[PDB]
Amino acid sequence: QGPHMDKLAAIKLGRYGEDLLFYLYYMNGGDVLQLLAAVELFNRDWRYHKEERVWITRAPGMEPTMKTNTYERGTYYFFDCLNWRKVAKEFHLEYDKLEERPH
Amino acid sequence: AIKLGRYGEDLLFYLYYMNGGDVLQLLAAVELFNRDWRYHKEERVWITRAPGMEPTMKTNTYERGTYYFFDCLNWRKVAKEFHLEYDKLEERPHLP
């Protein structure tokens, strides 16, 4: 790091002006992208579970075995960001544990 | 504002989990510091000397003068006279 990271930062940002630097320090790009991604994910029937802290969605071609006004049982895909994959699991889904539509 | 509906699911998760903004944030900080900007922890703002403006007061623990402040709310560089205590300025950025 140190002088090496100095060099990396210099190669990447050396030619640009202070305005880009601040744009990056306050993560204006990243934060928005993350938001736009959330919106689209939501559009594609992905819901974010608060406790499980992952994106989940009903396995297409499978309706919930049991359903009510507060919860539902069934098979859902869970996104594992650590291994960059999608895994299916029978799960007890409680609606109140889902974030609302982004934005 | 953008039309993401056309791209792969994998790209969406990439944008959500792995856009790399955090890394660019660190590099930005390193670059700011290397261009003589300092970050004031309490004021929560990046600061740099205004050119042609020597400090009015100068002691071994602080100085007073006019400096540039980047106002991230109004998104503009702003000049302000300020009492600057050195030990309130963060050291050069490093890995967390």
UniProtKB/Swiss-Prot annotation, chain B:
Family: Belongs to the CNOT2/3/5 family.
Region (Repressor domain): 5-96
Tissue specificity comment: Ubiquitous. Highly expressed in brain, heart, thymus, spleen, kidney, liver, small intestine, placenta, lung and peripheral blood leukocytes.
Described function: Component of the CCR4-NOT complex which is one of the major cellular mRNA deadenylases and is linked to various cellular processes including bulk mRNA degradation, miRNA-mediated repression, translational repression during translational initiation and general transcription regulation. Additional complex functions may be a consequence of its influence on mRNA expression. Required for the CCR4-NOT complex structural integrity.
Subunit structure: Component of the CCR4-NOT complex; distinct complexes seem to exist that differ in the participation of probably mutually exclusive catalytic subunits. In the complex interacts directly with CNOT3. Interacts with NCOR1, NCOR2. HDAC3 and GPS2.
Protein name listed in UniProt: CCR4-NOT transcription complex subunit 2
Segment of the intact protein contained: 433 to 528 of 540
Organism: Homo sapiens
Compartments where found: Cytoplasm; Nucleus
Disease: Intellectual developmental disorder with nasal speech, dysmorphic facies, and variable skeletal anomalies: An autosomal dominant disorder characterized by delayed development, speech delay with nasal speech, and characteristic facial features including upslanted palpebral fissures, anteverted nares, a thin upper lip, and micrognathia. Some patients may have skeletal anomalies, such as brachydactyly, toe syndactyly and flat feet.
